[PDB]
Amino acid sequence: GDRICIGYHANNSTTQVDTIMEKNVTVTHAQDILEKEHNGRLCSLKGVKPLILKNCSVAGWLLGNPMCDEFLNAPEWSYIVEKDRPSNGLCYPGTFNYYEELKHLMSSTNQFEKIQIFPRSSWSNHDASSGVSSACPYNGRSSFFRNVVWLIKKNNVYRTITRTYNNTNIEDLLIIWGIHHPNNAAEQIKLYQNPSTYVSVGTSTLNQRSIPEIATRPKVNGQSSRMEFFWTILRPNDSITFESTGNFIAPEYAYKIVKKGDSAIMKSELSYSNCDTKCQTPVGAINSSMPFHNVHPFAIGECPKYVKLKKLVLATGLRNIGAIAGFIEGGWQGMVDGWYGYHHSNEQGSGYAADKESTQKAVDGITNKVNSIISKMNSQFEAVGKEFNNLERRIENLNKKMEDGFIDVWTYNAELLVLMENERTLDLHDSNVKNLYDKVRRQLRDNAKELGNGCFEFYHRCDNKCMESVRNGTYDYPQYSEESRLKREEIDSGL
Amino acid sequence: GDRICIGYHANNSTTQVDTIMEKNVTVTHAQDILEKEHNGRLCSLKGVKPLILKNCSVAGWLLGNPMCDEFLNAPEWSYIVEKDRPSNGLCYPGTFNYYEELKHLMSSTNQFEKIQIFPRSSWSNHDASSGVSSACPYNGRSSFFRNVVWLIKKNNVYRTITRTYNNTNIEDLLIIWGIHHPNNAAEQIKLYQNPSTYVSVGTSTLNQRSIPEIATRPKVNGQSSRMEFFWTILRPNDSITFESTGNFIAPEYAYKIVKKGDSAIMKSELSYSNCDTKCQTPVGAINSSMPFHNVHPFAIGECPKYVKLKKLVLATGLRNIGAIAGFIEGGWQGMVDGWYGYHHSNEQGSGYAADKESTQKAVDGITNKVNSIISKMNSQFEAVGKEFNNLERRIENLNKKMEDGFIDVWTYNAELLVLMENERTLDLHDSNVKNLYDKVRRQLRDNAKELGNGCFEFYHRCDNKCMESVRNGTYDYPQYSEESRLKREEIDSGL
Amino acid sequence: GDRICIGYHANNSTTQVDTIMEKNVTVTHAQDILEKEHNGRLCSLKGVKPLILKNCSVAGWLLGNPMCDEFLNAPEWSYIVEKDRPSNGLCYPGTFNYYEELKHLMSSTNQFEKIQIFPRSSWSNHDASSGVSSACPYNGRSSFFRNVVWLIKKNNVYRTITRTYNNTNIEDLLIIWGIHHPNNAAEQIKLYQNPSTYVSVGTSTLNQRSIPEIATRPKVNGQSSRMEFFWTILRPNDSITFESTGNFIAPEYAYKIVKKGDSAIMKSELSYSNCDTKCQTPVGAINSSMPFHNVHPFAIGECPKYVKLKKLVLATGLRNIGAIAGFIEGGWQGMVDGWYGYHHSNEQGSGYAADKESTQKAVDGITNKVNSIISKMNSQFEAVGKEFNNLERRIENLNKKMEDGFIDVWTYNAELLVLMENERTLDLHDSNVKNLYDKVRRQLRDNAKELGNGCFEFYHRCDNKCMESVRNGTYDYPQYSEESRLKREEIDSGL
């Protein structure tokens, strides 16, 4: 008659965590921290739409391939989307010096303003209107890059050009020009007459002189000739000067770098959908609530940290339980307002009252460690897009190795921190449960008997008033010693 | 009279582990996980032999240095071995553009088929048979690279060459050619007559034009002239076109990239031995049983993970013990079929019976954590060979820094995971031993006395039948209460 | 009457650590491991002073800009200090090939010896004394780079130069030369007459031929022309040969690489102060006592490891406490010569005696784990200075990403090792305190009563002689059983 037990929570939970020791450990309370869902669309970053290059590449856009649309509104972009193998690029064949370096400069760039440095009508001494090619159809007629000029000899004359543009603005100016390589020596004279020509550029920082490389090459896009382009960034209060005796592909428009910041070149074959997100990946956007995802490693914006894992679940409550009176036997399904409590078993009581003095402190120590574990990975490696050419393979590998190299690490760190601190959590409950036992045992000494299954039976008589006192740490041995003494010896000489 | 003790294993083990807290901790059972033995030979990877370049370098091989042997059988290789400072390389001096990029392309390459694009007899209008040099002895006569042609003027004439090869196969074609730089202007006319010449190459992707750079240079291998080479990969359904007015070193044979995959260029001064392995390092092969080694950081194949450590030992059993009856005193040398057990001490028994209910569960939880710790490092950084030229030092450092940088990490990770989970293991036994005590104590309450040294003495009388019941969790207090009650008070008023 | 308690230390300590679970945990004993103070000066590394380039850059120094001071004493340096935007660099405009690669070669370099290869008087056939410019004032007169020669035509003649230097020494020789690009074709004839010229260099390893690139460029430092420079390292027993028909900027002095080793190029706008240190950062030197700092990530010398953290404190003693008799109640302010002890409470004693058997072992296990945690980070990533040009941005990023990438890791590792092993420490004391209790409890069985608050009261009578015996593990139950038996039943039938 008249007992009491120490026991813990257990409920209809079935979500399971893992540890270093065990796997698939059913628990009462746990939080998933891994996002692994994405919407599959291409969306804007917090109101700021991407530059969707469509079937075009970066070169075609900036050179003005007649198939690539230009951006007359000077839009701001959050990023730039370019298909994997873009169909509209160098419509007239050739090369594009330091293209990769220049794609990299887009990444810290958010807005352009196209300005006209050298208008087409200002080529008085040459034939500007004839440089076009079958390689470059607009409406199926032969045309050409809309931002450069294919200068051609006038009346069979090519006056040596010398022309300059002073950069009179505050922004950095992006300037592109090129040179033409003809098939045979006859085609050179056919177009520029001067048998030996050159194309010279001069700024405060970059000085070069390009000579035409005449060779026989396979017909690419119908053309056996090649045209290679150059670029440079003209500083404020500087001035560029071209001069050539022939083969000069001239600029008409320059690009004004008006907004530098956080951007990138995403390669995705998606097109835009009326849609916004805080995190974007080439395959879809992301619900940036959970601190970890495994969707794509190139994610941009306010994103959770990418790890290579199938699952990542924390452990917050105890592991689940029927398990009768006593913690030695398992969980009590009956408790609801706490993680640890007791069972009354009074002359006039039933049981089930939680110890809020230690549940609240435990709800405070785990949940305060849960967000704190998240904050331990803020400085986690985030990968960045980059591009390299067929003669840069070594540093392409190195980049991959480095980035793959950090991902493999932080995946391991994150897994380990979950696995370890999960076992540290469960071992807390076991220690907390077994500790609540002592708070009682230490305080009810001879007045009761340790049944062993984690319960106590009183040689004294408790009552509801007494049984709200050692829960609170106020029960007095001296107040109940004499009756406990007497009933104790009653069995010492009982039956 | 009639006692019982809780105790653990201890045996003739002397292997010792370390932890964060202690070092050289003698234990009963532990597994070494570090390979640090290698056979010292150069061997094949799972049946697939390496390409052993011998005293030759990659250039000498592919150019066909008369001293380098060619590989007529089109062999497949698992890797390529090249001595550190190979003696047979550019026998005729000069340069070799993008050599490092090309060594890097070997690494994803497993088999070549040499094919003849431009036969030697098809140089009708020039003198192909005279281009040789003292720089290039075969059988001590003056010869030349066996895969290119040193074209020379015929009857003091050098018709401008224009020649093409359409790539009519599926494989990528590797093509090498070069140009000659003569000593003085007289030597140019001596060999090619045309005072100003050039060497032009055209494909869909690469277009260049090289002009001879006439200068005075020290006699290297007897030659003050230089010959520099170029290479490019000709895609299927493409076509390369050379044309030159002089100085043209021509291809005869092209290399067909027939097998791409996992390979590498190992630098080792070893030669092949009839021998096979799953893991190879430049100093010897490896017994790929243990998950970690410290042999060499450039290891290729099915290899264990390389860490920079002298030793790496897990801990699986308890730490070793004479230590008499009781776990407070130490290990029991007497137990063999378990890690935790008891000692009978019956009127008619002796002792030593293991608790298999908890040994098997412990043999299951450690060994299940042992292999699981191994699997936590599958995605561990593996270094990759790479090469750089005397003007690429910065990215050479960066590569080293990065690779050294990851090794230092994963070494630390691995050490820490051992050190930590080793202490977690030992603390398990201590917790397991002390827990077996309670399973008993909780179940034999007043029927016995806690001696303190971890043993119990019965006020009741047990017997062999009773003493196979609380081991199993079936002993009944009520069944033995009255006798225990009576003998209990016998001493309460005894002597 | 006549009691005894188990309790621990507590003192006037207020330094607080953090863990994974808790923050700001007041403890008795802890060690700071983070340096975050620096002296703000630029100092020498262990007796070896830096090369302070002052307002000059590396180019100006080695070319001998008339404003840059030369180093006639052939000094050894521990490092090189160069302001961020150095004012004295290429005083005459132009370019400097592979400058970054060459700055990188300084980093493994500690001492130069300037030697004169080609004296100025030995330019018999040309005008060496006239090459100067307004771009290069010394004492406000027009001058020029003090280590190269601006060769100019004599009597309107420019004999084709052919000149060689055999490297007759053991050191590697560093050699710099350049070429001149004039404004207009008239300026070429004005200075060198030969309309088409070239500048050719030949060694065993490097062969090139530079042609002047005539173009119109903005007046930089008053000059619209440009002069670009080249460098190469001449091996022992080798020989370099220049020859030119014009535009040749010639070497007079070469640099002898006499000491290679650990050095670097620090960018700091500090100047030297009579001052020495073992660790230097661009903002100040460092007290290299603590194993971690957060001052600057480019630190050179015998330095502690840099982490990105505000604070990093270990935990060595227990957490601080008034807390009366008993460990259940808290710390005893009274103990001084130990971490764990007791309280006598004798008929003739007071209390407070430490258990040195377990304090010394604990002072040994923590302090032996404290230095050992430090040693777990010896192979920690240290960043290295490096430089890149406006067309190398991609690998600049990669370098940053990699280095930032490792710092973020090892910061996390170090934080985690503190946080975790701090909780492992505190949990040791709790386990140690509770273990000292059992050493007593296990040994004083029925002779006393467990009061619950962590104290014992003797049914026996102890005394000072008896109360130095279970502290030492020598107290005998049988020696004191009969009196304890008798006084035990005295209360069993007492009041």
HEC string of chain C equals: CCEEEEEECCCCCCCEECCCCCCCEEECCCCECEECCECCCEEEECCECCEECCCECHHHHHHCCCCCCCCCCCCECCCEECCCCCCECCCCCCCECCHHHHHHHHHCEEEEEEEECCCHHHCCCCECCCCCEEEEEECCEEECCCCEEECECECCECCCEEEEEECCCCCEEEEEEEEEECCCHHHHHHHCCCCCCCEEEECCCCEEEECCCCCCCCCECCECCEEEEEEEEECCCCEEEEEECCCEEEECEEEEEEEECCCCEECCCCCEEEEEECEEECCEEECCCCCEECCCCCCEECCCEECCCCCCECCCCCECCCCCCCCCCCCCCCCCCCCEEEECCCCCCCCCEECHHHHHHHHHHHHHHHHHHHHCCCCCCCCCCCCCCCCCHHHHHHHHHHHHHHHHHHHHHHHHHHHHHHHHHHHHHHHHHHHHHHHHHCCCCCCEEECCCCEEEECCCCCCCHHHCCCCCCCCCHHHHHHHHHHHHHHHCCC
From B202's Cα to the closest Cα of chain A, the distance in A is 5
For residues C152, C154, C160 and C164, what is the CA-based torsion angle, rounded to 10 degrees? -70
Cross-strand partners of A3 = A457
- CA atoms within 13 A of residue A231's CA, in its CB half-sphere: 25
* Candidates A207, A429, A482, partner chain C, best to mutate (most C CBs within 10 A): A207
Which residues of C fall below an 8 Å CB-CB distance to A? 20-22, 93-95, 181, 213-218, 220, 226, 308, 328, 390-395, 397-398, 401-402, 405, 408-409, 411-412, 415-416, 449-450, 452-453, 492-493, 495
Q: Which residues of B touch C384 (CB under 8 A)?
A: 397, 401
Which residue of A lies nearest to C216 if distances are taken between CA atoms? A202
Cβ-based contacts of B217 with chain C (< 8 Å): 202-204, 207, 241
Contacts of A401 by beta carbon, 8 Å cutoff, 6+ apart = B384, B402, B403
Nearest CA-CA distance, residue B233 and chain A, Å? 10
Distance from CA of C421 to the nearest CA of B (A): 9
Domains and CATH numbers, chain A: 1-48+271-495 (no CATH), 49-270 (3.90.209.20)
d(CA B301, CA B50): 12
Experimental method: X-ray
Report the greatest alpha carbon distance in chain A: 135
Tell me the residue type at A115: I
> Quick check: B203 and A217 CB within 8 A?
yes
A11 class by beta-carbon count within 10 Å (0-12 exposed, 13-18 middle, 19+ buried) = middle
Q: Measuring CA to CA, which residue among A140, A171, A190, A193 is closest to residue A237?
A: A171
Distance from CA of A270 to the nearest CA of B (A): 28
Sign of CA dihedral B270, B271, B277, B278: positive
Which residue among B98, B421, B443 sits closest to A452, beta carbon to beta carbon?
Answer: B443
Chain A residues closer than 8 Å to B377 by CB: 412
Separation between Cα atoms, residue A83 and residue A42, nearest integer Å: 12
Question: Coil, helix or strand for B6?
Answer: strand
Rg (CA), chain C: 38
CB-closest option in C214, C391, C405 to A381: C405
Instruction: Please note each residue after which chain A is broken, C-to-N distance over 2.5 A, or write none.
Output: 321
Look at residues A202, A131, A198 and name the one whose alpha carbon lies nearest to residue A165.
A202
Q: Do A205 and C390 touch (CB under 8 A)?
A: yes
Contacts of B398 in chain C (CB under 8 A): 386, 395, 398-399, 402
User: Do B62 and B147 meet the contact criterion of CB atoms below 8 Å apart?
Assistant: yes
The number of angstroms, rounded, from the C-alpha of A11 to the middle of its chain's C-alpha atoms is: 36
Mark yes or no for CB contact B401/C402 under 8 Å: yes
| Phi, psi (deg, nearest 5) at residue B356 | -75, -20
| Rounded-to-10 torsion of CA B467, B468, B474, B480 | -20
Do the chains contact at A405 and B381, CB–CB below 8 Å? yes
Is C214 in Cβ contact with A379 (below 8 Å)? Answer: no
* Cβ-based burial of B316 (10 A; exposed 0-12, middle 13-18, buried ≥19): buried
DSSP B371-411: HHHHHTTTT----------TT-HHHHHHHHHHHHHHHHHHH
CB atoms < 10 A from the CB of A389, how many? 12
Chain B interface disruption, residue of A401, A404, A430, most B CBs within 10 A: A401
Q: Distances in Å between the alpha carbon of C491 and those of A492, B490, C111, C346?
A: 14, 18, 91, 21
Resolution of the experimental structure, in angstroms: 3.2
Least Cα distance to A277 among A31, A37, A54, A106 occurs for A37
What are the residues whose beta carbons fall under 8 Å from the beta carbon of A423, sequence distance 6 or more?
Answer: A19, A20, A21
Neighbours of A403 (CB within 10 A): 21
Q: Is B482 helix (H, G, I), strand (E, B) or coil?
A: helix
Nearest Cα to B173, choosing from B209, B205, B208, B210? Answer: B205
- Residue B458 phi, psi dihedral angles, 5° rounding: -85, 125
Look-up of token digits 């109101």 = A47
Question: Is B237 exposed, middle or buried (CB count within 10 Å of its CB: 0-12, 13-18, 19+)?
Answer: exposed
B277 pairs with which residues across the strands? Answer: B45
Q: Is C413 close to B412, i.e. CB distance below 8 A?
A: yes
Strand duo C207-210 + C161-166: pairing:
unpaired
Q: How many CB pairs under 8 A join A and C?
A: 103
Tokens at C252, concatenated? 């007079």
SS3 state of residue B275 = strand
Q: Distance, in angstroms, between B64 CA and closest chain A CA?
A: 24
Cα–Cα distance, B208 to B241 (Å, whole number)? 11
Closest CA to B13 of B32, B28, B23: B28
**Residues near B465 by Cβ (< 8 Å), separated by ≥ 6?**
none
Burial of A458 (0-12, 13-18, 19+ CB in 10 A): buried
Which residue in this structure is represented by tokens 């007897």? B222
- Return the closest-CA partner of residue B285 out of B81, B52, B80, B39: B39
Rounded Cα distance, A205 and A226, in Å: 27
For B308, the closest chain C residue by CA position comes to C379
Upper half-sphere CA count for residue A453 (Cβ side, 13 Å): 14
B186 closest CA partner among B211, B214, B210? B214
- Residue in B21, B215, B452 closest to C443 by CB: B452
- The verdict on a CB contact (< 8 Å) between C377 and B412 is yes
Cβ neighbours of B490 in C, within 8 Å: none
Closest CA to C292 of C380, C364, C203, C206: C380
List chains touching B (3+ CB pairs under 8 A): A, C
Per CB-CB distance under 8 Å, the chain C contacts of A100 are 394
Chains contacting A (3+ CB pairs below 8 angstroms): B, C
DSSP state of B480: G
Using N-to-C axis directions, what is the helix angle for B356-375 and B393-441, rounded to 10°? 170
Cβ within 8 Å of residue A140, ≥6 positions away? none
In this complex, the residue of C217, C405, C449 whose CB is nearest that of residue A406 is: C405
User: B interface mutation test: which of A216, A221, A226, A306 has the most B CBs within 10 A?
Assistant: A216
Token duo for residue B300: 């290729």
Q: What gap in Å lies between CA A139 and CA B446, rounded to an integer?
A: 103
Measure CA C65 to chain center. Answer: 33
- For A297-327, b where at least 16 C-beta lie within 10 A, e where not — what string? bbbbbebbbbbebeebbbbbbbbbbebebbb
Minimal C-alpha gap between B424 and chain C (Å): 11
Name which of A216, A328, A416 is nearest B241 (Cβ-Cβ): A216
Quick one: which of A154, A165, A172, A178 has its CA closest to A63? A178
Asked if C207 and B213 come within 8 Å (Cβ–Cβ), the reply is yes
Task: State both tokens at C120.
Answer: 């100025």
- The residue behind tokens 């005072």 is B195
**B contact set with C (CB within 8 A):** 20-22, 93-95, 181, 213-218, 220, 226, 308, 328, 390-395, 397-398, 401-402, 405, 408-409, 411-412, 415-416, 449-453, 492-493, 495
Vertex A284: Cα angle to A281 and A288 (nearest 5): 70
Contacts of C162 (CB under 8 A, 6+ apart): B216, C241, C242, C243
Task: With CB atoms and an 8 Å threshold, state whether C241 touches B220.
Answer: no
Q: Taking CB atoms and an 8 Å limit, are C241 and B405 in contact across chains?
A: no
* β strands within B87-238, DSSP E: 109-116, 133-138, 141-143, 148-150, 161-166, 172-181, 199-202, 207-210, 226-234
